[PDB]
Design a protein around this ligand. Structure first.
Ligand code: NA
Ligand code: NA
Ligand code: NA
Ligand code: NA
Lengths: 190, 187
């Protein structure tokens, strides 16, 4: 598809972070089975969602600098951006129907309970948050806030939990948890 | 409480791995929730005599043990059965809650095998891959006894078949770093 932006590490800020409107970024590379599976699907989506979504690709072999800035551990990974901010993430192979469902749910949009985690160490990552909160119930989204300049955790993140009771159980249990050398604060985001 | 065992790195093998159901509590002096739960342990230790042993491992005194079980914080409880991790519970909890946890783990879901993990793979990687697909109940990274490096494989347990299946269909062939993964239902 001629509608898909060919990203580079240098074009990322302009093409994604300053874009208006939703941008779906595909992290991929030539040595990757599921990349090849989803490539035709992304082409059809770029056509079928034109006017509501822009599709962008970043080859991580040629552009090794971006994926680490978003905690991206492998490929294929889809990141949905809105106004310069990650709204949602989808990892690995998927069907066209499944991609549409992801897009449609995240383009509509606020669902789940939001938890605020403060005083994370500079090495904290999405993995840490998944491992803390996942045992308590279904989590739909995790966001680690990273410093623009460093790529390190800026000291806080968020987790989104489907059911209120599970979220309050995680909060009651994880507040005060000492993760490495940092005692954590864990609360409902007001 | 005299019912507690006092673990050291050097006695871990003997007290935990070579012994036969124990609950290990990783803790330290600078830790709020550790103080909150330490009285609940003593109640459990006398209250579970015969059926379970409680032991403690101070992570300052004994800093070897934690990263060999991928423990990143305290407090963390690990339930071993015959030398392997059966279950884990992180953070503060009521007596009620620890009862629930011990009762149900003495005493499951769909078991997923992940193969070709790199040597630095940990439980966080697995939570992060599988968590988005729905309810995960347990993850286990298999480590080498000698290196404490991931041996190349792990397991995840997921409650709901359709979620497990979607995770398998999506994550098989995912390239995590320089390694392509196999993911399958365990047979
Ligand atoms: Na490539
Ligand atoms: Na939940
Ligand atoms: Na997600
Ligand atoms: Na599940």
């Amino acid at each position: 598809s001629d509608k898909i932006i060919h990203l580079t590490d240098d074009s990322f800020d302009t093409d994604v972070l300053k874009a208006d409107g939703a941008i779906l970024v595909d992290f991929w590379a030539e040595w990757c089975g599921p990349c090849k599976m989803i490539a035709p699907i992304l082409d059809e989506i770029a056509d079928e969602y034109q006017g509501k979504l822009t599709v962008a690709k970043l080859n991580i072999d040629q552009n090794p600098g971006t994926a680490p800035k978003y905690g991206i551990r492998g490929i294929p990974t889809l990141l949905l951006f809105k106004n310069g901010e990650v709204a949602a993430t989808k990892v690995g192979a998927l069907s066209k129907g499944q991609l549409k469902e992801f897009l449609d749910a995240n383009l509509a949009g606020a669902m789940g309970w939001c938890i605020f985690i403060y005083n994370l160490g500079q090495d904290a990552d999405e993995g840490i948050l998944w491992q803390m909160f996942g045992p308590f119930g279904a989590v739909t989204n995790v966001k680690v806030i990273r410093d623009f300049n460093t790529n390190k955790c800026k000291g806080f993140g968020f987790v989104t939990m489907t059911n209120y009771e599970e979220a309050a159980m995680a909060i009651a249990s994880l507040n005060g948890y000492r993760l490495g050398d940092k005692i954590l604060q864990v609360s409902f985001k007001t």
